[PDB]
Point group: C2
Chain length 99, copies 2
Amino acid sequence: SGWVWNQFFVIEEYTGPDPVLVGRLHSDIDSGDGNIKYILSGEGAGTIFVIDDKSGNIHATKTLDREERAQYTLMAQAVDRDTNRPLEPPSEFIVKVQD
Amino acid sequence: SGWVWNQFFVIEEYTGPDPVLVGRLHSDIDSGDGNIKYILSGEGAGTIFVIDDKSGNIHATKTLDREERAQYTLMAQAVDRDTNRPLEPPSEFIVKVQD
């Protein structure tokens, strides 16, 4: 419908050594049995942004400076914990570092 | 698809008498010329949660406690700034008060 909902943000001074919550990848088919696995990839994945593939929560790990980088494009995936076959179609989302 | 992008969150220990950024409403028909007006409705709209109807930035105005309220369900709308004709269908979104 043209609404845009697939972005998170981190309000920056909150960033540093201590990990802060960015957001949660989540499919509506996740019954909570923990048999779906969330795969994060893209800009800053596995360094700046890290995910728990059971809970789907993304954290920021470093001090971030909006001047150096305004935002990051990451890719979401939801695959089955055992077949590893995609449930949801992979989709991009953006993380915006806040002023 | 079944991806869920329409929930913001607020970390408890940042809420207070200082407004915290919650999220941005945004349509892709927004051309950044201020002709689209962002409207918020439902639980806490216009008290707890406040919008700038031009940028679409949402803010939390109060301390929040997930013990008292885990969750706020609200409604996002967009109208033409002077005709007030809706430009999008309403879209429900929820804000989660984070542990």
